[PDB]
């Protein structure tokens, strides 16, 4: 549960990070499939599912579009990501555990790229934010 300074914090960082959202998404999604290969079955219908892959690149763009969407809806993550939750938690039946994974990979990709903006303080609020995302996305399970 995001405080006013948590929101401010997420926003100032997204403001700096944002330019590279596509690079971040592609990079984050490739690390996920490569270091936690249990996650490759959700994308098994794609031809090429390797770090290069045009498939990986397009969808990394989409995921980060979902993070931007959530920065916008940070006052109500629950109603802001209800569509995404319907699809992930209800249609795709994505194992909740994968969200901790993808989230970790995103944090690693940001350390990679913006080592200097990614302070411990920023780290705390981005983490409460990614956890709130996950909880919001978990809405349609049960």
């Amino acid at each position: 549960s995001l405080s006013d300074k948590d929101k401010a914090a997420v926003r100032a960082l997204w403001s700096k990070i944002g330019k590279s959202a596509d690079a971040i998404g592609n990079d984050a999604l490739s690390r996920m499939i490569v270091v936690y290969p249990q996650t490759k079955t959700y994308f098994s219908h794609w031809p090429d599912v390797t770090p290069g892959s045009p498939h990986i690149k397009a969808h990394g763009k989409k995921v980060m579009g979902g993070i931007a969407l959530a920065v916008s809806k940070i006052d109500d993550l629950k109603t802001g990501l209800m569509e995404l939750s319907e699809q992930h938690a209800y249609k795709l039946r994505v194992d909740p555990a994968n969200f901790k994974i993808l989230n970790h990979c995103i944090l690693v990709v940001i350390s990679t790229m913006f080592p200097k903006e990614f302070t411990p303080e920023a780290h705390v609020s981005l983490d409460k934010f990614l956890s709130g995302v996950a909880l919001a996305l978990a809405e349609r399970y049960r």
Binding site: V34, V35, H104, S111, T112, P115, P120, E121, D127
Partner: protein
Amino acid sequence: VEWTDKERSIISDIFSHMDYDDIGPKALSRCLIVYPWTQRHFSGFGNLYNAEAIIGNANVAAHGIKVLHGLDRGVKNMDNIAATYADLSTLHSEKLHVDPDNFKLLSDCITIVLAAKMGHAFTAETQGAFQKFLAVVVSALGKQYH
């Protein structure tokens, strides 16, 4: 799995170019700050009042250096990881009573701190070898209590 030559190479490479002094203090600090319940166990350390008190606390710094030095011993012993950590295991699980989830929290912090120091050199493949290493050692700090 069990070690590949490729992984042995990478892991030894990461540890031989690593600055313990820089990385250790930073991984622990961050762990104490992002997952603050963790501080319950570092009571004797002192001023942990807020994020900047932790970053400059010398007790924390020196102890971060020792977690790293403890990683180094499993590096030297990749085929005998569970017996090298027995002693550690016992201290963390029966003298100290640290939920095992915490070992995984400290690990993520070491990766995060390493990713920022290595930049683009910290490849998906290098991330994979390293998480394997830490997985295996997190199993050994817990292992005996279940």
